[PDB]
Amino acid sequence: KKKVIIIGAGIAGLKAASTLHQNGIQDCLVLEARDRVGGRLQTVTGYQGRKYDIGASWHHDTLTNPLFLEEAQLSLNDGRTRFVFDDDNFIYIDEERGRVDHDKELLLEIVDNEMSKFAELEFHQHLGVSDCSFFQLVMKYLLQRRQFLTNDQIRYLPQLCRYLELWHGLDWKLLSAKDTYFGHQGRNAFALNYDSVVQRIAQSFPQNWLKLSCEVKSITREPSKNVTVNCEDGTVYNADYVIITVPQSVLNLSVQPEKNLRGRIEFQPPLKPVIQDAFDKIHFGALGKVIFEFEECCWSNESSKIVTLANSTNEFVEIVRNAENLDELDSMLERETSVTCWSQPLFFVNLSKSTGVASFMMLMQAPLTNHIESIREDKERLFSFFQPVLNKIMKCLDSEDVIDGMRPIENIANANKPVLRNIIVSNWTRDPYSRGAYSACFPGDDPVDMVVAMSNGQDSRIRFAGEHTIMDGAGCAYGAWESGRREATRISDLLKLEH
Amino acid sequence: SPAKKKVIIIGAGIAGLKAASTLHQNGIQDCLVLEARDRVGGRLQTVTGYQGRKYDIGASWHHDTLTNPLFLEEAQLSLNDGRTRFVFDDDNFIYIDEERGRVDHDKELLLEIVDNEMSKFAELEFHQHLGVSDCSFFQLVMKYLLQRRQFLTNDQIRYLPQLCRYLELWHGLDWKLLSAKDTYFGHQGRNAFALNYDSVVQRIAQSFPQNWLKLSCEVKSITREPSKNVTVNCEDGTVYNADYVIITVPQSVLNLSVQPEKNLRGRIEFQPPLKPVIQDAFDKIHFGALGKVIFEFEECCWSNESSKIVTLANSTNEFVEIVRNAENLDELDSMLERETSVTCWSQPLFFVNLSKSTGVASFMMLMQAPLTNHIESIREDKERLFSFFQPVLNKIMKCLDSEDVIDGMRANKPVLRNIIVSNWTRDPYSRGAYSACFPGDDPVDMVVAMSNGQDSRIRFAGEHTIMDGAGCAYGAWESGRREATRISDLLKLE
Numbered sequence: 004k005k006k007v008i009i010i011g012a013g014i015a016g017l018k019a020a021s022t023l024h025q026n027g028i029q030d031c032l033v034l035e036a037r038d039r040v041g042g043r044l045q046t047v048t049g050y051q052g053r054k055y056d057i058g059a060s061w062h063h064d065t066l067t068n069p070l071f072l073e074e075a076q077l078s079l080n081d082g083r084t085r086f087v088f089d090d091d092n093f094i095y096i097d098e099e100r101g102r103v104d105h106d107k108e109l110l111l112e113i114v115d116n117e118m119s120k121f122a123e124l125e126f127h128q129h130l131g132v133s134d135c136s137f138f139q140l141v142m143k144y145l146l147q148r149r150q151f152l153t154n155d156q157i158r159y160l161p162q163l164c165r166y167l168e169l170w171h172g173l174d175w176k177l178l179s180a181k182d183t184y185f186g187h188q189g190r191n192a193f194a195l196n197y198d199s200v201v202q203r204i205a206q207s208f209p210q211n212w213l214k215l216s217c218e219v220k221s222i223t224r225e226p227s228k229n230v231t232v233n234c235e236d237g238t239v240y241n242a243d244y245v246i247i248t249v250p251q252s253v254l255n256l257s258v259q260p261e262k263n264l265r266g267r268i269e270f271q272p273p274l275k276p277v278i279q280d281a282f283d284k285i286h287f288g289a290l291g292k293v294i295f296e297f298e299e300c301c302w303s304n305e306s307s308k309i310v311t312l313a314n315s316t317n318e319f320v321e322i323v324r325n326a327e328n329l330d331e332l333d334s335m336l337e338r339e340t341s342v343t344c345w346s347q348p349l350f351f352v353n354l355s356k357s358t359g360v361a362s363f364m365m366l367m368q369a370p371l372t373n374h375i376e377s378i379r380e381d382k383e384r385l386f387s388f389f390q391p392v393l394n395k396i397m398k399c400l401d402s403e404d405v406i407d408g409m410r411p412i413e414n415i416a417n418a419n420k421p422v423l424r425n426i427i428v429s430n431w432t433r434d435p436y437s438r439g440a441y442s443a444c445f446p447g448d449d450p451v452d453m454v455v456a457m458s459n460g461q462d463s464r465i466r467f468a469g470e471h472t473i474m475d476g477a478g479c480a481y482g483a484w485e486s487g488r489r490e491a492t493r494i495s496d497l498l499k500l501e502h
Numbered sequence: 503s504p505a506k507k508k509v510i511i512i513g514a515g516i517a518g519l520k521a522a523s524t525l526h527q528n529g530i531q532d533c534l535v536l537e538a539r540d541r542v543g544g545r546l547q548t549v550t551g552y553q554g555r556k557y558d559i560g561a562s563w564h565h566d567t568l569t570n571p572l573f574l575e576e577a578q579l580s581l582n583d584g585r586t587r588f589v590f591d592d593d594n595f596i597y598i599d600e601e602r603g604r605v606d607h608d609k610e611l612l613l614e615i616v617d618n619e620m621s622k623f624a625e626l627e628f629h630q631h632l633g634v635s636d637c638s639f640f641q642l643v644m645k646y647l648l649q650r651r652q653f654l655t656n657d658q659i660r661y662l663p664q665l666c667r668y669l670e671l672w673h674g675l676d677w678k679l680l681s682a683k684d685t686y687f688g689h690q691g692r693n694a695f696a697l698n699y700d701s702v703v704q705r706i707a708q709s710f711p712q713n714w715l716k717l718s719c720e721v722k723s724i725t726r727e728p729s730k731n732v733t734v735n736c737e738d739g740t741v742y743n744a745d746y747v748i749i750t751v752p753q754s755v756l757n758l759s760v761q762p763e764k765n766l767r768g769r770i771e772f773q774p775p776l777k778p779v780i781q782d783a784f785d786k787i788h789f790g791a792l793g794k795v796i797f798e799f800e801e802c803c804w805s806n807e808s809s810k811i812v813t814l815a816n817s818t819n820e821f822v823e824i825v826r827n828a829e830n831l832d833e834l835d836s837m838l839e840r841e842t843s844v845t846c847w848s849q850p851l852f853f854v855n856l857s858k859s860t861g862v863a864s865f866m867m868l869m870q871a872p873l874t875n876h877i878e879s880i881r882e883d884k885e886r887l888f889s890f891f892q893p894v895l896n897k898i899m900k901c902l903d904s905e906d907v908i909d910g911m912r913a914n915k916p917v918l919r920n921i922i923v924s925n926w927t928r929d930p931y932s933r934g935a936y937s938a939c940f941p942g943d944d945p946v947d948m949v950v951a952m953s954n955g956q957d958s959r960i961r962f963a964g965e966h967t968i969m970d971g972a973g974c975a976y977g978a979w980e981s982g983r984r985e986a987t988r989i990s991d992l993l994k995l996e
């Protein structure tokens with residue numbers, strides 16, 4: 004009944020649809036399981052009408068990111084503000100010591116940079132001579148360079164460099180050392196409404212093409228020259244080509260038995276071996292977010308980027324100074340509970356400086372992410388959990404301890420104290436249609452496989468699009484966006500050319 | 503009649519010194535190290551100043567400490583005996599503009615951040631696209647401003663280009679003389695300020711027979727006798743017969759060999775003449791002029807926040823307007839051509855506040871060409887020097903919580919007592935600082951021609967004869983170890 008059937012209304016599938024239309028193609032559909040378009044791009048509304056991207060927030064690699072370049076051309080034409088370059092000098096806060104950034108004695112940013120080159124030198128030209136966890140790599144570095152590292156550098160450096168966890172959404176012991184570092188193609192641009200980006204692409208094709216709330220439960224390839232798709236509601240479709248953009252985590256459900264899980268699509272014939280084997284190259288990290296909405300700004304807007312360090316011990320230094328080798332240090336690190344806000348690094352975007360909004364956007368990683376999203380409706384507990392980091396931040400920013408004002412109890416005796424009015428938490432690890440944030444590597448993985456296998460398609464008719472199906476922009480909004488145009492282009496020609 | 507020697511080394515710089523050390527270490531005997539100066543070390547030279555304070559007027563740091571084999575060897579020592587040989591002095595750079603004052607780590611300018619985007623822009627410009635022409639570093643910066651003007655503020659367009667020029671002090675060349683393709687390069691980790699490079703020189707120089715060292719003998723010619731002997735002639739008339747020879751004179755001095763005129767201090771006459779691959783390589787690589795001026799003060803009475811300070815050359819809002827209105831690169835150059843004397847604010851200057859790294863109340867300042875040539879050409883007129891650097895010397899103190907400097911070369915205010923200056927450009931046996939690229943240059947040609955030698959018996963060593971460590975003290979060092987090892991094996995087979 005259709006020429007092309009796109010599964011998923013995230014940016015990949017939306018672009019793909021936008022392309023097909025652009026190329027005069029017709030009779031296509033966009034089946035989306037959620038009751039909204041956007042996928043991992045969602046802008047929610049909070050206190051006093053403030054808006055926040057609960058999913059993607061930035062345009063990365065602005066020197067070459069094509070979606071960003073496109074958005075920039077639009078802004079040059081209409082002068083409408085679509086983004087703001089918010090990169091800043093990071094402030095680093097340790098619970099006991101306070102600020103440790105740009106320290107005349109610690110000079111942590113300089114050793115972190117050395118640490119970075121150490122990493123590149125370890126994996127460059129050796130062909131993956133063993134892949135460890137980012138944690139293990141940092142341990143090698145510390146051991147190898149302790150003769151040129153002070154005591155405080157050995158103590159704090161490993162904690163500061165963990166900000167990298169917030170880039171993969173993975174704790175440093177679950178994250179591949181080889182994929183930890185990546186090239187940043189220029190500054191980052193905070194999207195002032197990724198929902199604006201989603202809206203544009205969504206309104207660029209036949210509105211009657213979109214079918215919200217259609218959960219696709221099975222895709223069958225009948226050699227007859229067509230693909231049959233069945234929505235969970237009973238409707239069936241026959242398409243020449245099908246573009247699947249469900250996230251990798253959802254797709255990984257196919258290789259498992261018991262096709263009852265939400266989102267899971269039964270393939271017939273089953274996904275070919277190169278594909279199924281690719282799912283052994285790890286995947287899915289869990290970057291999470293917590294938005295803290297205050298009444299008004301009453302702290303120093305020195306910087307828009309703040310990272311709180313996990314607690315560290317002088318005793319750890321001693322162990323590094325006494326370890327004879329790696330194996331001895333590996334086991335010597337046997338210090339024998341309870342996870343608090345100081346158990347992992349946290350990344351706070353002070354939105355007051357960059358957007359003038361009295362709020363903080365907080366990013367978190369696995370394993371913490373799922374635990375916080377699990378209590379997302381318990382505002383009071385969430386407050387108790389982050390209260391100590393929040394207060395430490397306010398202290399360092401020439402302000403006072405936070406007052407809980409999430410419940411209607413107006414008082415003017417607190418005009419010089421930050422007042423929390425609301426907390427918003429993401430829900431990506433618990434949403435069945437995302438089951439996580441985006442592609443990520445566990446030690447021992449190699450993403451190339453999935454990208455090549457996904458890009459090569461199930462076959463000439465069953466194709467794949469999404470952040471996990473491409474090299475440039477892997478895991479990013481523009482990668483997914485570009486993967487959509489890719490499959491669309493391939494199909495666009497194969498059709499129009501015939502007739 | 504001429505005294506027989508197994509190997510003759512020309513130049514007692516770190517390359518020749520290391521070459522000899524490796525020969526002795528390999529059991530070779532009857533060797534000579536001929537040096538024109540009255541000292542060893544060459545571009546590694548430690549001088550003494552006000553009250554006995556010592557400074558490296560040539561090489562100061564151990565670069566790429568994660569791989570630098572020389573540095574590693576120096577660290578091993580210090581680990582055994584626990585003695586201080588070096589100090590990691592990298593720090594957060596303090597950046598100073600004449601008016602604005604400090605512009606580093608600024609919440610509005612964010613210069614270091616756009617500076618980072620710039621280098622990434624350079625990487626993407628060449629490292630990923632063959633065929634692209636070279637242009638000067640200056641032209642690359644303008645090309646960057648033009649492409650990213652939509653995403654830069656006025657103060658950034660104005661101050662960024664002056665800040666990124668700290669790179670001039672890595673090459674010893676003004677950004678209009680510098681090859682853009684060669685501007686950026688990766689640093690293999692932190693740097694280490696040698697606390698006496700002359701300690702490195704002496705250690706290596708005393709690891710081989712002393713009688714081997716012949717100071718003050720300037721070599722004037724080298725000849726291959728079609729058979730297996732090399733004739734070397736000192737200027738003092740002495741003559742030597744040798745199986746092999748490792749030439750370590752600077753690239754700038756070896757270039758005098760392809761010119762017609764035998765009476766030039768340092769010039770060596772070759773017979774047969776240097777092969778065409780060597781001669782033609784000089785057209786594809788050049789020499790920079792990094793210079794030094796060390797300001798010695800009575801006592802420290804300034805802030806020791808950082809040990810790294812860079813003074814930016816003046817900029818103008820007129821410049822931002824031209825960048826904003828330029829249609830393309832062609833027009834930008836046109837408008838830029840909108841035309842007095844040279845001042846301490848005409849180019850970026852890099853000062854090392856030694857007070858924080860070593861505790862000595864003195865500033866080590868680096869400068870580039872063409873300024874280096876001018877400043878060394880008047881290095882004797884101390885009064886004129888003070889006058890020249892007084893403006894910047896004062897702005898630094900103003901920014902480091904202090905007052906104007908007081909000339910005391912002849913209670914809480916900084917008093918200048920001495921001004922020492924380098925002399926590498928005018929010195930006949932150095933003629934510049936080290937190898938560097940002008941736009942269009944390709945260092946590979948030279949490194950290739952040098953590492954393959956004039957022939958089987960006539961070899962070359964030195965900072966200009968190797969890829970890893972090119973221009974650095976450890977590169978020369980390694981090149982010396984290279985030529986001596988190959989020779990040892992060949993002699994070994996006898």
Ligand SMILES: Cc1cc2nc3c(=O)[nH]c(=O)nc-3n(C[C@H](O)[C@H](O)[C@H](O)COP(=O)(O)OP(=O)(O)OC[C@H]3O[C@@H](n4cnc5c(N)ncnc54)[C@H](O)[C@@H]3O)c2cc1C
Pocket residue numbers: 010011012013014015016034035036037040041042043044057058059060061062063217218219220248249250253265266267268290291292429431436437439440441468469470471478479480481483
């Ligand atoms: C917390 C967080 C922060 C992030 N921040 C950034 C950032 O700053 N910058 C950046 O570039 N990227 C960021 N990302 C990643 C970025 O959001 C994603 O790469 C991108 O949105 C993925 O798009 P997609 O179209 O491939 O998939 P979506 O993930 O867009 O997937 C497409 C659609 O598939 C649908 N679907 C699933 N199963 C079925 C089914 N069975 N039937 C029908 N439809 C189905 C889903 O409902 C979904 O709408 C972030 C991600 C997270 C989780």
Ligand SMILES: Cc1cc2nc3c(=O)[nH]c(=O)nc-3n(C[C@H](O)[C@H](O)[C@H](O)COP(=O)(O)OP(=O)(O)OC[C@H]3O[C@@H](n4cnc5c(N)ncnc54)[C@H](O)[C@@H]3O)c2cc1C
Pocket residue numbers: 512513514515516517518536537538539542543544545546559560561562563564565719720721722750751752755767768769770792793794924926931932934935936963964965966973974975976978
């Ligand atoms: C101002 C300045 C700062 C520097 N800073 C650093 C730094 O921080 N870190 C770093 O790694 N490098 C630095 N360098 C570079 C470093 O000093 C050189 O790479 C290295 O010392 C060159 O050593 P060489 O043995 O190759 O040559 P020299 O240049 O060492 O040459 C060897 C010898 O040849 C002798 N000679 C010349 N002609 C004749 C002749 N006709 N007969 C006999 N002998 C002759 C010379 O007198 C000289 O002593 C700096 C250089 C300069 C000029």
Ligand SMILES: NCCCCCCCCCCCCN
Pocket residue numbers: 169170171350366442443444477478479
């Ligand atoms: N501090 C940055 C927070 C947002 C990070 C988004 C990263 C997207 C790209 C991931 C690249 C690696 C994918 N395996």
Ligand SMILES: NCCCCCCCCCCCCN
Pocket residue numbers: 671672673684792937938939945972973974
């Ligand atoms: N910081 C003073 C200079 C330190 C040594 C720099 C060596 C390389 C200079 C450029 C020429 C060699 C690489 N092309």
